[PDB]
Design an enzyme around this catalytic site. Structure first.
Site, PDB file in Angstrom:
ATOM      1  N   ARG A  55      31.700  -1.191  12.743  1.00 52.34           N
ATOM      2  CA  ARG A  55      32.316  -0.006  13.325  1.00 52.34           C
ATOM      3  C   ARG A  55      33.731   0.219  12.806  1.00 52.34           C
ATOM      4  NH1 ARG A  55      27.725  -0.596  14.398  1.00 52.34           N
ATOM      5  NH2 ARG A  55      26.619   0.173  16.255  1.00 52.34           N
ATOM      6  N   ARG A  91      18.031   0.083  18.595  1.00 54.56           N
ATOM      7  CA  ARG A  91      16.907   1.010  18.629  1.00 54.56           C
ATOM      8  C   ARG A  91      15.600   0.272  18.891  1.00 54.56           C
ATOM      9  NH1 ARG A  91      15.470   4.193  13.193  1.00 54.56           N
ATOM     10  NH2 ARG A  91      15.193   1.994  12.601  1.00 54.56           N
ATOM     11  N   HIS A 122      -2.588   2.740   9.051  1.00 50.82           N
ATOM     12  CA  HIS A 122      -1.591   3.772   9.315  1.00 50.82           C
ATOM     13  C   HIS A 122      -1.466   4.739   8.145  1.00 50.82           C
ATOM     14  CE1 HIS A 122       1.644   6.014  10.766  1.00 50.82           C
ATOM     15  NE2 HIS A 122       2.652   5.180  10.582  1.00 50.82           N
ATOM     16  N   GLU A 123      -1.747   4.276   6.926  1.00 49.17           N
ATOM     17  CA  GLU A 123      -1.684   5.124   5.745  1.00 49.17           C
ATOM     18  C   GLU A 123      -3.038   5.683   5.332  1.00 49.17           C
ATOM     19  OE1 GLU A 123       1.270   6.023   5.248  1.00 49.17           O
ATOM     20  OE2 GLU A 123       2.306   4.769   3.778  1.00 49.17           O
ATOM     21  N   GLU A 171       1.848  11.610  12.161  1.00 46.83           N
ATOM     22  CA  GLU A 171       2.206  10.251  12.540  1.00 46.83           C
ATOM     23  C   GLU A 171       1.441   9.754  13.759  1.00 46.83           C
ATOM     24  OE1 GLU A 171       6.411  10.067  13.051  1.00 46.83           O
ATOM     25  OE2 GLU A 171       6.867  10.706  11.001  1.00 46.83           O
ATOM     26  N   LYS A 175      24.931   5.669  28.092  1.00 43.66           N
ATOM     27  CA  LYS A 175      24.239   4.398  27.897  1.00 43.66           C
ATOM     28  C   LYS A 175      23.879   3.758  29.232  1.00 43.66           C
ATOM     29  CE  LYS A 175      23.952   3.747  23.396  1.00 43.66           C
ATOM     30  NZ  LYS A 175      22.655   3.496  22.710  1.00 43.66           N
ATOM     31  N   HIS A 211      19.000   8.358  10.513  1.00 43.67           N
ATOM     32  CA  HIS A 211      18.518   9.696  10.830  1.00 43.67           C
ATOM     33  C   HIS A 211      19.643  10.697  11.055  1.00 43.67           C
ATOM     34  CE1 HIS A 211      15.190   6.988  11.629  1.00 43.67           C
ATOM     35  NE2 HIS A 211      14.358   8.014  11.631  1.00 43.67           N
ATOM     36  N   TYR A 220      10.209  11.549  16.863  1.00 38.39           N
ATOM     37  CA  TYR A 220       9.610  10.302  17.319  1.00 38.39           C
ATOM     38  C   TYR A 220       9.328  10.300  18.815  1.00 38.39           C
ATOM     39  CZ  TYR A 220      11.215   8.668  12.750  1.00 38.39           C
ATOM     40  OH  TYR A 220      11.439   8.523  11.401  1.00 38.39           O
TER      41      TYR A 220
END
Lengths: 198, 588, 50
Positions: free
Chosen positions: B144, B248, B349-350, B377, B456, B480, B490
């Site tokens: 940071r 995340r 997944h693909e 997705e 938060k 992102h 998402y």
């Protein structure tokens, strides 16, 4: 008869005339329409269908009494980098008629704006190029379709056959057919010759 | 003469020329992703420059065609995706400045300044594997005070430039551009304006609130065994004890929290070595999986032009889980496939992305892809989750049918998926809500970082170990955010994952929960799901959702029916004095 | 003569009935009696007396 069992054609279908009775049937005039298209455009080529291919390139008659010969071709006319040797009409003012093509250039006018013989706003050149590349799918491959036409006119049918030939049997009272003349008897030997033109 | 007969002519003229240019732009990039050399660099830049110039050239000419003169409700929906404008809607002097900021924030994020070391696998293993309080805390604070300082002058100018771009396209804030993908314009009965999207997300978040309190309390109670003086049972969790740098994904925290030690998660890696798999049988088993469902097979050129193995050192390149769609009947997958259990679930997944692109093969280039990228997705996750089902592993060749399902096995399976599917779900709503006040104008620049920590403890429940001022940048260091990507996409993926799973398991004779369901051995769920993948941009996402689920909006009920054994077990474990967290607590 | 057996028609080569090869169509088509058709397409009950 030696074309269906060759196992070298993709779609081998006929219309009107059966694919079996044509072996012992006469014909008058037989033609062939050779053209290279895509894979998805093969299903559009049928007597009774429509679309942007069967109406602006080649119109099939409603009473089509022939066959549709089409096979897959990959190692014959394919190259990397886009194919620019075959064109096709995409849009036009009027449609087409059976046994009639259009090779002259014409600027398509979608709206009501003049084109002055050059493309631009609402003015396009309906002669796009195909994408025959060896790295695309199956439908984007060149298919050399050869459509055969069976017509019957007032002229005598000179395209008959093929006739089957057996052997020569003698000293037996069996049936024989020589040049249309049907007879039943023993083919005995002769002691005199005839003229070489009767 | 009219407008409808001349609009389709320009679309067919553009589609016949865009496929020839988009294929060359993707084929030239495929050479760079196969052999690293200086020849493929110039071929990729020249192929991509012609595509970026031809797309913007035809978009300006299409502005003369009317938009509100289409009564077919099909051609009008294809003109909105072509007549749209990007960052070039403003002045030319300010257009090049916005692109420069996107090139500077991406370089600092890729090249870290923590001394040198980068991000992954540089600082990724430190924040995950450390087991120390004075070690991983220094890595979170140094990021940071170094990366956040260099991204401070660029983040302030990023808001003023992106705000004028959205208002120039008849909107309000920049958040409406990312949320405008689910918006259905035109005249219809099932329309979906931006006002309806504000609700239906705030409603489903309240039902999942008691579920997140039991999951967050289990992670907090587990960390007290190693930190008996820094984490309180009635408090929260620090910003450096979440697994990742930004907090995340909580996948790295699964190694410390194991509910049952008798029958944990099995590993099918050793079973694949006995059958001798040359990094090719994984895709063969995935091909026969969709046959029993109802989806057709692939093409002949798919197994001859797609590299599904590791080239090694003779052909050094890159490989990442990202599906490619070159078009024109060509479909290739770029991913290093090795003998690994993680690669088996990722293959499904693909594999579903290839069948999705083949649904609209006959459709033009403008009608490609669905109404939103959230449905693509979702199909890849509903198929990969069924592969990890213990019931599906009993009817295959590898692994022992001697390990059946029980109560001690489902607990270890639901917790592993809860730290990734629903673990980052409240973080998406908190990040999206915080960016709405910045794009609007409710908070001046000096009120961005002080408000980030207030959301938060009220939504996620994460405190701060060291108080930071307004100079530091915490959300600006995200992949992102710095690279400009819609993170709210998402959020809908999590809700649509359980809604589409219930529809496929309803016709497959599976009731109740969805942990023991089996998509295979049922030729009915395949034909029902294929109707949604076929409809691309020609039909709104509201109509395609009813054909599978049955409702015209999102639902939270199927999301809670999958975590039934987990929610029943967490209420008997966290009754250790505290359920939830306090908004007034600090470790220092 | 009454024929209550369903067979597959064969045309030329690629024989059918069993192996089911090429040129093996399905001649047993359907009429398509619908109330939204014309007059000649309506079903007629023909009773032959012998």
């Amino acid at each position: 008869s030696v074309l269906y069992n060759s196992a070298s054609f993709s779609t081998f279908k006929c219309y009107g005339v059966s694919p079996t009775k044509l072996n012992d049937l006469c014909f008058t005039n037989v033609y062939a329409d050779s053209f290279v298209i895509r894979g998805d455009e093969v299903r559009q080529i049928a007597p009774g269908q429509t679309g942007k291919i069967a109406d602006y390139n080649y119109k099939l008659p409603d009473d089509f009494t022939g066959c549709v010969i089409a096979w897959n071709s990959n190692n014959l006319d394919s190259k990397v980098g886009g194919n620019y040797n075959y064109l096709y009409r995409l849009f036009r003012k009027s449609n087409l008629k059976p046994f009639e093509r259009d090779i002259s250039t014409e600027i398509y006018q979608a709206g009501s704006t003049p084109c002055n013989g050059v493309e631009g706003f609402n003015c396009y050149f309906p002669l796009q190029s195909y994408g025959f590349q060896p790295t695309n799918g199956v439908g984007y491959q060149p298919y050399r379709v050869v459509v055969l036409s069976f017509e019957l006119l007032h002229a005598p049918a000179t395209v008959c056959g093929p006739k089957k030939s057996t052997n020569l049997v003698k000293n037996k009272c069996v049936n024989f057919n020589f040049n249309g003349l049907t007879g039943t008897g023993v083919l005995t030997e002769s002691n005199k010759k005839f003229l070489p033109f009767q | 003469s009219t407008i409808e007969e001349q609009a389709k002519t320009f679309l067919d003229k553009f589609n016949h020329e865009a496929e020839d240019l988009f294929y060359q732009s993707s084929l030239a990039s495929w050479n760079y992703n196969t052999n690293i050399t200086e020849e493929n660099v110039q071929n990729m830049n020249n192929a991509g420059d012609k595509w970026s110039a031809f797309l913007k050239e035809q978009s300006t000419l299409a502005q003369m065609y009317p938009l509100q003169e289409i009564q077919n409700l099909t051609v009008k929906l294809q003109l909105q995706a072509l007549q749209q404008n990007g960052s070039s809607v403003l002045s030319e002097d300010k257009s090049k400045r916005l692109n420069t900021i996107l090139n500077t924030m991406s370089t600092i994020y890729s090249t870290g300044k923590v001394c040198c070391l980068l991000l992954e696998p540089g600082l990724n293993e430190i924040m995950a594997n450390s087991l120390d309080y004075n070690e991983r805390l220094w890595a979170w604070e140094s990021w940071r005070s170094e990366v956040g300082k260099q991204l401070r002058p660029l983040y302030e100018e990023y808001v003023v430039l992106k705000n004028e771009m959205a208002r120039a396209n008849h909107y309000e804030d920049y958040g409406d551009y990312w949320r405008g993908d689910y918006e259905v314009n035109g005249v219809d009965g099932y329309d979906y304006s931006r006002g309806q999207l504000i609700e239906d997300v705030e409603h489903t978040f309240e039902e999942i609130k008691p579920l997140y309190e039991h999951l967050h309390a289990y992670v907090r109670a587990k960390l007290m065994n190693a930190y008996p003086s820094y984490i309180s049972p009635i408090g929260c969790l620090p910003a450096h004890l979440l697994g990742d740098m930004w907090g995340r994904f909580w996948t790295n925290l699964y190694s410390l929290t194991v509910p049952f030690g008798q029958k944990p998660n099995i590993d099918v890696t050793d079973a694949m070595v006995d059958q001798a798999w040359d990094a090719q049988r994984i895709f063969k088993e995935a091909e026969k999986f969709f046959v029993s469902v109802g989806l057709p097979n692939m093409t002949q050129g798919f197994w001859e032009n797609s590299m599904l193995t590791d080239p090694g050192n003779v052909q050094k390149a890159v490989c990442h889980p990202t599906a490619w769609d070159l078009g024109k009947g060509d479909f290739r997958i770029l991913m290093c496939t090795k003998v690994t259990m993680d690669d088996f679930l990722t293959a499904h997944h693909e594999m579903g992305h290839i069948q999705y692109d083949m649904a609209y093969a006959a459709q033009p280039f403008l009608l490609r892809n669905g109404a939103n990228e959230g449905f693509h997705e979702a199909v890849g996750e509903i198929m990969s989750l069924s592969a990890a089902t213990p019931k599906h592993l009993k009817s295959i060749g590898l692994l022992s049918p001697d390990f059946q399902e029980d109560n001690e096995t489902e607990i270890n399976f639901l917790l592993k998926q809860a730290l990734t599917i629903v673990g980052t779900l409240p973080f998406t709503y908190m990040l999206e809500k915080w960016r709405w006040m910045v794009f609007k104008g409710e908070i001046p620049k000096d009120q961005w970082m002080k408000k980030w920590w207030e959301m938060k403890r009220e939504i996620v429940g994460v405190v701060e170990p060291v108080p930071h001022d307004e100079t530091y940048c915490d959300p600006a260091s995200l992949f992102h955010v710095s690279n400009d990507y819609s993170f709210i996409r998402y959020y809908t993926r999590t809700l649509y994952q359980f809604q589409f799973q219930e529809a496929l398991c309803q016709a497959a004779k599976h009731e109740g929960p969805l942990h023991k369901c089996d998509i295979s051995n049922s030729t009915e769920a395949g034909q029902k799901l294929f109707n949604m993948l076929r409809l691309g941009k020609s039909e709104p996402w509201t109509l395609a959702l009813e054909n599978v689920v049955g409702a015209k909006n999102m639902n939270v009920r199927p999301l809670l029916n999958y975590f039934e054994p987990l929610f029943t077990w967490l209420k008997d474990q966290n009754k250790n004095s505290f359920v939830g967290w306090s908004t007034d607590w600090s470790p220092y």
